[model samples]
Structure formats: structure tokens, C-alpha cells
Target: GSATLGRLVRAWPRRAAVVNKADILDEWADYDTLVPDYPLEIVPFAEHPLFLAAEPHQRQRVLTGMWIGYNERVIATEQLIAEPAFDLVMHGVFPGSDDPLIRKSVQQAIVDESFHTYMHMLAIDRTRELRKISERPPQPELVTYRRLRRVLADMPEQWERDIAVLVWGAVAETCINALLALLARDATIQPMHSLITTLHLRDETAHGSIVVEVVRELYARMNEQQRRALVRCLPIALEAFAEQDLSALLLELNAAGIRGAEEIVGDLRLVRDFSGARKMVEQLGLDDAVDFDFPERPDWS
Candidate 1:
């Protein structure tokens, strides 16, 4: 694992220029008002009668809200979930991470995450400015963030807390590829939005690889008790990542002044494919040890 991390670390500089110089996103910007702010196909409520009956402009506003939510979710995961775990790794909370190369590599990934967060923040700001989204919804805590908090809230030991955060961060970093891809390659949306997602996708792929290697090194050092704890917590993290923020969606729907908002959000709780998280578990050879059954990895282009 260290060898793998070493190779990735060495290759980072050439492969990840945008992360270091995020202004490349600014240069790539060619925002188009004519394009959709988000992908309608992925919106669970896009087909609902209430949503379909809305004025095109109102529906556009709803999509803009979704765009903002998408970026906000990414920012939350990077800052609230991953940064602390990276700090833990850099500080050697986990065994085998005290090495200079490992610490420095994790530090560099943190820098990449900082740039990612900045990109998303600007994405939200830009969308609101152009869309004239003056009345914002009260977005509930993200399901992933809320789940992590609920799980960690009662843990009495520091090691338990650390392992949970580390595992959640690792899962999150690895799993968001598909989420970002929803917009990353979609040329129909704002070009600058796609550019932001593309740059972030590029940076996060490296972070995923590094997290895999680092977590493997950390895993081998954990005692059986800790291993069991990790196994028990895997679903919490995966499910959290897979589930949607229905509560937030309801609020956004209502905030957009779409009648039957409650009806639109009432019947469905959106779910994303868990293939990315499942693939990571299988790659790590942790599949057999996990007690819960993850759905088969689905095909997503």
C-alpha cells in the first residue's frame, strides 16, 4: 500500500495541475444562460406532475436550486467529513502514516480538497447571481453528514471516533466520482459548471487512489476489535453516501413555489448507485469481512 501511495504521490504533480492552480476553472468558464443549470434526467422530481406543470422559468429555478445543492453537498463533504480525517492521517493518528512521504502526500491532498471546496462555493455563488435565486431553501443537513454525526455522537472512545471519521472520509472521497460525473461531462449544462465538475473530478480521482492506499496501510495496523468496528460501520457510511436528502428536496421544492411540493417529494427518497463504494470495498478485499450485503455494482456510464 505504501508503495502504491508512493507511486501516486510521485505522479501527482504532473497529473493534477488544476488542483494546484484552480484558476484554470476560471479560465475554462463560458457560462451559458440558455443551458440547464443541472441535469433534469437525474432529478427524481423532474417528471412529477407538479414539477412538469410549473412554468419553464420556475422549473429552471428549481434546477438552479438543485445545482446549488449539488455544489453545497460537495463542499460539505470536503470540509466537514474529509479534512479532519486527513488531518488525523497527517498527524499520524493512524499507524504507518507518520512517515514524511505519507504525511506530505496527505497534506497535498488536503490542499486539493481546499481547492475543490472553493470551486463549489463559487459555483453556488455564480448560479445564484445569474438565476436571481433570492429566496433560498433551508437545506437540511446532508444525509451523509447527518449520518456521520449521529454515529459519532455517542462513541465514547477517541480511537473509535477517529476510525469512523477516517473510514467515512475514505468512502466519501472514493464514492463521489459518479456524483460529480452527473455534471462533469454534461455539455448541455453551463460550460463553467461542467468545467468546475470536470476539474474536481480529476482531482478527486487522485484523492480516491491515495485514500485507498493510506486506508489499507492503516487497516493492517488495526486490532481485530477495531476491524470489527470498521466492518460494522461500513454500511452506515455507504448508506449515508447512497441516500438522498429528501428533506432538503421538499424544502427546495416548496421554496421554489411549486404547488403540490409536498406531493412531489412525498413518495420518493432518491438513491444514487453505490457502485463506486462497493467497488472500493471489493478492491480492498474487505467484501468478505463486511457483514452487510452491498448491492451488485451497477453499470453507470
Candidate 2:
């Protein structure tokens, strides 16, 4: 760990790479690299076969809700690309992987996510086309995503960096896993939908696992002040997951004469259910490990 500080200082423009060597080192100690052959075939959902089946649409609602989180990630990407504070947030993260296996896996995951994004766009288009609708699918709601992006951009301290990474890893990744699990388990989804979901899920599982391990190591290394800082931000991070405004999306769907806009928004409430999801965070032992002083109902504009 003594060498880590020197290495961090030398690695300029760090993204995901700084964590790569350590991640690989830890992986080697546990087991050999076992990147699975991600299935590419789209499976059919037999139980509810329509695009808007109540149950399947419920899943889409959750998925669309989760897209808000991804919206935040994409916002971070743009903000980091545009500003100096990126250096502060990325101080400990390296950009790409050097380990052949890890590099290939991360690259493949990126490719899969790219495909998933496009395919989802297509799925939305196809639904519109089949329904003889004219309105375009809505872009992600940007307000909350942008707000959080700015908060991350101004991360002046390492403790804030740790908290951002934990929130991204724990809350964001876990919700993604939940949404993808539904898409994967469904047997009646369109062929392309299923394939895209499976491929994306495979990559996300790797990311989620890597993040959990990284957070564990990071938490163990924090001192009192850093721990306190992380604790202070926990509630804000949790609340941010549910603060999104899907008005743009709902309006787009309504303009297209699509039914179920309200139900979609309603079902999206699942993202912040805070039941099973919080348990996953707790099981990771982060709940008890960090000291958070949540102010009483503070408002974020």
C-alpha cells in the first residue's frame, strides 16, 4: 500500500486503470481468470409475449428508471472530459487495462454496453413503428444527472472521490443488476432485446463484482476524517437515485399516443424500493463500516 501513493501520483489522467493491477492481483489470489463466453442469442419470453404486456412493460419501466442512473454516468463522462476537476476525481483510477484478460474483458464490456444502448434505441423505435406512432423516444432526463455530475466534478477531496465511487458501484451497479436480471429472466422479450440484455448483463456483472472489491479495499484504507466525509454523503447519494424527473420521457411517450406512461413512471418507483437493494449494500458491510452524519432533511437545489 505504501507504493500505491507514488504510483497514483505518477499515473496522469487515471480512469479505470489504476485499479486494474490491484484488481488483477486480488483476482489472482482467489482464482484464475474465468471470463465466461457471453451468450449472444436473443431468447423469447413465453409468459408475456407482447411489447407492452403489463408485466413486461413493468420491467421496461424499471429499466427506463435505471436509465436515469446511466444518464448520470454519461453526464459524468462528459463533465470529466470537459474539466480539470476530473483529475482530482480520477486521481486513483487508471484509464485502461494492461493485463490481457482484464483488458479484454473490460473492452468487451464496453462494446457490449454500446451495443445495448443502440439496441434499446432500436427496440423503442420498433415499438413506435409497429404502433404507427410518430414521436421519438425520449432522451434521458438530464437535471438530476447533471446536478450530480457537477457535484462529482467539484470533488475537492479524496474522501468525496471514495464516496462517489462507492455510490456508483453499490447503488448504481446493484440497480443495474436488478433491472438486467428481470430482462434476462423474461422469456418472451424480442429476440434482439434478450440478446442485448444478456450481453449487457454479463459485462455488468463483472463491473459490479470489481466495484464491490474495490470499495472494500478503499474503505479499509480510510481514516477517521475520510470515513466521516463518506458518511456525510451517504444519504444524499441514496436520495439522488430517486430524484430524477422523467417528465421528458413521459411526455414523449404521451405525445406518441402511448398508453401506460403513468404506469411506467409508477413502476419506476422500484429503483428506490430500498428494501432488497439496501440489503445488498449492507451485506457488503459498507453500512456499518462508514460513519455518515445525515443532516435532517437538507434540501439540494
Candidate 3:
């Protein structure tokens, strides 16, 4: 851990990469052949037979709305939840370490995350314009942040609260890295969607690694009580990663007034399972790396 931090500190200045929003906006300013009216498979269910049964244009509307919704949710979580948790760690935990390297890295991460929020918001706005979508889909509450807050409220100790925030932030960063990697490589989707994911993934790859190392360093300095508190928070963090409101997705489909929208929602409810969710965690090497016991299947219900 010591050697790893030392290496990162030495490489920090030279390793910094600059990404400008203006450049991205300029390149993708106008819609072209690559920018489709709808997404191919932004979410897991977009390609399902049930969803495919809807009228072509109607399905496209729903899919496009889902794509925008996905971006909005990510933006909200990053700006509202994950970024604040990170700020807490920067102020509360990193100060005790007395290491400028840790402080500088986290400070850079704050900037990176803020830029991510900006990028997603831009994507959503442009997508709305391209698709001619005016009405915003209903935004369901992301229960993950709510759950973390509930747990935090009951904890009286300062250190316990700090660990809770750190664990939650780490879980979010790792899961997002895995999700973006898949999205970035998907060629069938709208070119712009893939492009956005690719750009975000470039920065996230670095951000995720830095956060993981920070968590490792923090863990090494913990006492037995703090370690147990972190472990107990592990399940909550994992559950947060799996949480999704399919009902809200159904609402979007229905709002499109598609013929098979109701049927699609019913069928999805029957067949939706967590096998893929578990595979995501495993693929990211989180299953092996996390010390806590993960459920055989993460309950998305």
C-alpha cells in the first residue's frame, strides 16, 4: 500500500489528462448519420423480445427517453450523492493522513467528477434536442443515497460516518467503471452515446483506480471496530449498485402510448433476474477483492 501510494504520487503530475467540454460540444455539435433517433440497447431490457414487440417508432421513443433518463440519473447521483460523500472524505478522513499526495489526488477527483456531471447534462440536453423529446420522464428516487443517509443518521460516531461514506463512494466508482466499459464498446448503439461513454470511461478508469487505492490505504489504518463497521456497510453498498426502478421505465413506455407497452412491462417483471447483475460484479473483480460475503444473487426486487 505504501509503495503504491508513493508511485501514484510521483506519477500524478505527469499523468494528468485534460479534457475540454468545448471540444466535445464542437465535434458533436450537429447530428449526423452516426447519431440515431433512438438507442440500440442503453439498458439491459432495451433489446428484450417484450420491448421489441412495440411499434417501431413508439419503441424508439421509449428507448430514447430511457437513454436520457439514464444520463439524468447518473448526473443526479454524481452531483447530489457520490460527489458529496467524496467531499466528506476529503475533509474528514484525508486530513488525518497528513499526506499531500492523498489530498491532491482527491482534489483532482472532485474536479473530474464535476466535469462528469457537466458532460452527462450536456448529453441529455443534446439528446432531447436531437430526438425532439420535450417532456421529461418521471425521475424515480435513487434509493441508494437514501439508504446510505438512513444508516448515517443513526451512527453517532464521526469515524463510523466517515467509513460509511468512503465505502459507499468506492462502491459507486467501481460499478460505474464497469458499466461505462461495457457501454463504450457497444457498437450497435447510437454513435454519440458510445462516444460519450468512451470519453467518460477514459477519465473514470483513472478515477476508479485512485479511489480503490485510497480505500485500501484507509482500510490499512483502521482499527478492528472500524473494519467491522466497513464490512457491515458492504452489503448496503452492493445493494445500492443493484437498485433500479423498473416501474419508472414502464411509466416511460406507457407514456409513449405504445400498443404493447403494458404487455412488455408485465413480461419483464416475470423474467427479470439478477444473474447478470452478479456477473457484472464478478467481471469487475469486485467479488474476489471485497472481503464481505456477497449474496448468491443480488435482489433487484
Candidate 4:
């Protein structure tokens, strides 16, 4: 990871320039207006008896498992957006500029994220109909967002801020980039599943491109003090990717009567990785020298 991150840092300027030329953002906008035309497909317990006939504990696990994507869409797009932490990160540094292009790109990105939030709500609404449930659980343990905010708040100077942006933009976004790719590979999945992943992939791919470029451009302008600060903050930023939230899925599984609730929750090891992005940069022969290191591998116990 460190190797990948270092290369990206070294080649920030060229990458930024290429991103502008690629016009991926325009491609992202193609599906920006999409709305799922179908209503939720509710499968009642009697109708879908197997979903409940599992061990009582196991049932809830399965239900919750089914809701994970919905929860992800809700929290990342909705709840996470509402928190001031995200605002602080954006406003503190890359506050909108007079540059029409940059400004337009930022606005489009926000709209994309907002669309993701709405898409998840749509999925949840549809899921509720399928299961005949009155309500899904509210989001839980937004520790990742809070921790990110605390780290950013404690950043004493421009260098720390720069690293945070790189991690958030480069590493975190790259991880999402990989997930989106994985989802695309599994296209045989349900229609709603395909749409959700496909829409997110379109937007996030653009975001990944923007992040590398943005980091490179910003890093070039920083002084030595700033560089040192960014290096210091890198570890903290990297830790953010090594997190998972199993509550929603656990609740669903428990509700669906799945057995081994603790075991299942304990086994939840959802994680994000950046090796794919690193390979992408290398394959494209991108000159940016950014790289990363996993100080500790992600685990669930």
C-alpha cells in the first residue's frame, strides 16, 4: 500500500491532467438520473417459508444479511452525509472555488453521492415490501465517520490535512473502487442489486480518478512541513479502511431466525483493499509514486 501511495504522490500533476482529459465525470453523469422503476418485492414469511424455517437465530442473520446493501446505501449516502464531519473535511480544505470546472465537478460528485443515498432508501422501501416489515433498523455505529472527523480535527497543519485527503480520496475511494468492480463481476445477481452496484460504480470510478489527481495537485503545492505532516497522518487514515459494521446484517439474520448469531457476526470480515487501484495505476503506467502499507491486516474475531 505504501509503495502504491508513494508513486501516486510522486506523479500527482500528470495524473490530474489526464483525469481532466478522460472526461470520466461526464460518463458518470450518464446514469445519474436513473430511478428504479419497480416497487419493493416483498416476500412474506408464509410465502418465503425457508427464510424463516432456518434456526430461529439463523433467520435474523439471513434477513440482516439481505439488508446489508440497503444499510450501506443509507448510511454512506444519507446518515454519513448529515454529519458535520464530512462538511468539515470538505470545507476545511477544498472549499469550492471560482474555477468553473472544479466547481462543476464537485457539485456533480455531491449529487452522485446524494443519489446513492436516495437509491439505498429506495432499496430499503422495496425490501420492506418484500419482507412485510414495518421498518428497518436505524443506522448504527458510525464509528468510521466519527473517527475520521477526530483525526482531521486533530491535524495541526496542511500536511496532515493533505494526507487525510489522500487517504479518504485515494485509499478509501480506491477500496470502494474495488468493491464496485467486484459487484460488476457478479452481474447475474438480482435486478436491484445490479442497478445499485452499477450506479455506484459509475460515480465512484470518477471519484477515484479525481482523488489521485486532486492529491497530486495539492501535494505539489505544499511545503516540506506539509509533506512531513501528511506522512504522520497516513497511518491513522489507513486505519479507516480496516473497519466493518455488522449490526444491520446481524439484526436481519437474527430476525430471520438464523442460528449461530454470534458466530456469524464474529465471522463478518467485510473490508476494503487498494491493491487493485495500485495495479491500475501501474498498468496505466501512471507516474504518480503514491503507495500504501497495511500496518495490520483487517480481521473479525
Top candidate on lDDT is: 1
Order by TM-score, highest first: 1, 3, 4, 2
TM-score of every candidate: 0.90, 0.49, 0.79, 0.61
Per-residue lDDT of candidate 3, residues 1-301 (tens digit): 3465567556645454334443566546556744453445445567667666768777677767766766877787787666876787677564344466667677777877877777778778787777777776555766677788788888899888877887787777655533455556767776667777777766665666666666666666678788678766776787766665567667777777765666666666212233433443454345655544443432322
Best by TM-score: 1
Q: What digit string (tens of lDDT, one per residue) describes model 1 on residues 98-129?
A: 87777867988887887778778777777787
What's the distance in Å from true for residue 96, model 2?
Answer: 16
| Model 3 Cα RMSD, 1 decimal | 5.3
lDDT of 2 by residue, 38-66 (tens): 12122112122232554544444433333
Ranking by lDDT: 1, 3, 4, 2
Task: Write model 4 residue lDDT over 1-301, tens digit each, in one string.
Answer: 2344345444433433233323322322333213332222321231234443576444433533454544464356334422222333355454332334443444455555555666666556555554456654655545566676787786677645545654454555545533344444454444555556566666666655554544444455556666555555544555655555566545665655555555556643235555434543444334353344542322210
Pairs with backbone N, CA or C atoms under 3 Å apart (clashes), candidate 1: none
